[PDB]
Write a protein that binds this DNA or RNA. Structure first.
Ligand SMILES: [Mg+2]
Ligand SMILES: [Mg+2]
Ligand SMILES: [Mg+2]
Ligand SMILES: [Mg+2]
Ligand SMILES: [Mg+2]
Ligand SMILES: [Mg+2]
Ligand SMILES: [Mg+2]
Ligand SMILES: [Mg+2]
Ligand SMILES: [Mg+2]
Lengths: 70, 153, 107, 50
RNA sequence: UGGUAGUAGCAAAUAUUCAAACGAGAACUUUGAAGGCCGAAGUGGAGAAGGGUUCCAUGUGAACAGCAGUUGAACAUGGG
């Protein structure tokens, strides 16, 4: 149904933006009836709310280039 | 209520009315004229073909501007379109008329449309914004639709 | 007889030759669906997400020229649409599209 | 403005309370011609002045 | 209230695709995946002036959001 409220609440609790918040696409009915920051923590512990890992930005190419610079 | 022309044989006739329908009058009138003399089942499949862009509605009176289509030749006309929501609205009206015939207790498979009429409803205004701080109306063109079906052999 | 599964290869390059850069990939999806509907008499065609990822692997303006697709006509589930059966398209990771006939797989 | 004065805030308070719709039981009166509240105010059409 | 006329147009800022869910109805809502943009003088996060309930939740889809909308800064209820 509607999950904007849950996504905003999950982002606020997780201290990260809604970009990295992963809501379970299977248990949408379970997620949709949370509507409270206290029980989304229960959902987080259950694992239905997971923060996606940070996008990789490796400096290995930069370090290899700087080795030739040195 | 009071219709335009009463059926000649009210015993075996069904009626349907729709007032203040948000659909273009010019499209509705010309898609009504095509199905004016059709059978009930033939009209319904014709409307479905119009919705699926398989059969076209020839634009005869409100003909200015609308381009040509290959399907118009079967109507003896050079211009046609496929107004889907106009077809859907009177398709619902045809279904409502069929329900009325079922309620009255008539043979559905023998219904031929005789009278169908489209009139202009009171326009409802909206606002559009033009250059130099000018305001012009954005009038809609709703229509009234009236239909009567009578059994035929 | 009707519940069948068969895999082909689609020449996306041939089927989208001449389309704009910002329209290649979306039209490639349309042509894949059109090809499935053309070769199997079923307007209901569903494209798997893995196939969607494979087509959009490079970009909107860059698509693989040939792609291997497993096309399966399956009996429809509940929520009865007018189409009594549906078609499913699955990507087939293949190293080389050479001397590959349109083989018919079996259960 | 978040630094509202007391008088302005009180004036806004009255306008907000005036902006509510007419109750549905009034138009059942005998000598009634009020089909709707014609003096409703919207924050995007009328700016209330001030 | 007509002809114009179902006409002009709905072309400033690269771009969407797939599957599912609610739903009677989905190019437009939500989720998940992919492909993108803003590229830290931002399409980010917070203020002053200004606006004054537009902030939050539920319900409706009568009217408006120049298509549509299951969406809204729309409407009705209660909070803050
Ligand atoms: Mg003319
Ligand atoms: Mg002309
Ligand atoms: Mg303008
Ligand atoms: Mg101006
Ligand atoms: Mg035009
Ligand atoms: Mg523009
Ligand atoms: Mg902010
Ligand atoms: Mg809001
Ligand atoms: Mg609209």
């Amino acid at each position: 149904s509607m999950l904007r409220l849950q996504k905003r609440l999950a982002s606020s609790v997780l201290r990260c933006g809604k970009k990295k918040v992963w809501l379970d696409p299977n248990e949408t009915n379970e997620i949709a009836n949370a509507n409270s920051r206290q029980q989304i923590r229960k959902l987080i512990k259950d694992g239905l709310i997971i923060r996606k890992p940070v996008t990789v930005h490796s400096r290995a190419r930069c370090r290899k280039n700087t080795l030739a610079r040195r | 209520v009071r219709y335009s022309l009463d059926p000649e044989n009210p015993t075996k006739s069904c009626k349907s009315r729709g007032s203040n329908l948000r659909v273009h009058f010019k499209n509705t009138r010309e898609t009504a004229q095509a199905i004016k003399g059709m059978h009930i089942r033939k009209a319904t499949k014709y409307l479905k073909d119009v919705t699926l862009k398989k059969q076209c509605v020839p634009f005869r009176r409100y003909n200015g501007g609308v381009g040509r289509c290959a399907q118009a030749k079967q109507w003896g006309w050079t211009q046609g379109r496929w107004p889907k929501k106009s077809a859907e609205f009177l398709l619902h009206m045809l279904k409502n008329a069929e329900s009325n015939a079922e309620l009255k207790g008539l043979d559905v498979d023998s219904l031929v449309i005789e009278h169908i009429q489209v009139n202009k409803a009171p326009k409802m205004r909206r606002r559009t914004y033009r250059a130099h701080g000018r305001i012009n109306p954005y009038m809609s063109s709703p229509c009234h639709i009236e239909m009567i079906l009578t059994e035929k052999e | 007889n009707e519940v069948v599964t068969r895999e082909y290869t689609i020449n996306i390059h041939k089927r989208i030759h001449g389309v704009g850069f910002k329209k290649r990939a979306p039209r490639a999806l349309k042509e894949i669906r059109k090809f499935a509907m053309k070769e199997m008499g079923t307007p209901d065609v569903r494209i798997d997400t893995r196939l969607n990822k494979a087509v959009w692997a490079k970009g909107i303006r860059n698509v693989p020229y040939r792609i291997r697709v497993r096309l399966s006509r399956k009996r429809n589930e509940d929520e009865d649409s007018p189409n009594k059966l549906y078609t499913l398209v699955t990507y087939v990771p293949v190293t080389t599209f050479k001397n590959l006939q349109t083989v018919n797989v079996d259960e | 403005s978040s630094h509202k004065t007391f008088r302005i805030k009180r004036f806004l308070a009255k306008k907000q309370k005036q902006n509510r719709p007419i109750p549905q039981w009034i138009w059942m009166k005998t000598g009634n011609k009020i089909r709707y509240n014609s003096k409703r105010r919207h924050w995007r059409r009328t700016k209330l002045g001030l």
